[PDB]
């Protein structure tokens, strides 16, 4: 299964599934600073799933590993901003992270396998 380009549509489909998840709603668009005035005191690099989708559609990811790094930043930002492990929004982040990691593992494996096949000779 050695298509070097297949990851892109696989990531578009997984982002579609993430946007159907009620657990993604807090992570779809940027944090408003009027509502969370200290957010940028804690978070140096904001990230959200609309920014991930637009970067993909612009042709500004070279690999699914780069997309995976930005999605993982969404979740680490939630973990750093939460005042407790038991917050609503951080609890939604943990379920959505488990869903994402379950689905991205084959996308990464197939891509890396396809690159190794390309360089086999
Ligand atoms: C459009 N998206 C946003 O505005 N976001 C809000 C901030 N955020 C977080 O990841 C996060 C982690 C924990 C919390 C809030 O915790 C509370 C704790 C007790 C009472 C009320 C809230 O927010 C990203 C999504």
Three-state SS sequence of 45-75: CCCCHHHHHHHHHCCCCCCHHHHHHHHHHHH
- What are the angstrom distances between the C-alpha of 37 and each of 27, 50, 67, 92, 109? 17, 22, 28, 21, 40
| Cβ proximity of 97 and 77 under 8 Å | no
Number of structural domains, the chain? 1
DSSP state of 8: H
Residue 93: domain span: 1-121
Residue 14 CA, ligand 1 centroid: distance in Å:
23
The two tokens of residue 69 are 């790094």
Resolution to 1 decimal, in Å? Answer: 1.2
What was the elucidation method?
X-ray
Cα 44 off chain centre by: 17
81 lines ligand 1 (CB under 6 A): yes
């Amino acid at each position: 299964s050695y298509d070097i380009q297949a990851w892109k549509k696989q990531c578009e489909e997984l982002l579609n599934l993430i946007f159907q998840c009620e657990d993604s709603e807090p992570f779809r668009q940027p944090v408003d600073l009027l509502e969370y005035p200290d957010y940028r005191d804690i978070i140096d690099t904001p990230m959200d799933f609309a920014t991930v989708r637009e970067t993909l559609e612009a042709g500004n990811y070279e690999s699914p590993m780069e997309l995976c790094k930005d999605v993982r930043l969404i979740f680490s930002n939630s973990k750093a901003y939460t005042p407790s492990k038991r917050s609503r929004i951080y609890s939604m982040s943990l379920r959505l992270s488990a869903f994402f990691e379950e689905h991205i593992s084959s996308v990464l494996s197939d891509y890396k396998s396809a690159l190794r096949f390309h360089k086999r000779n």
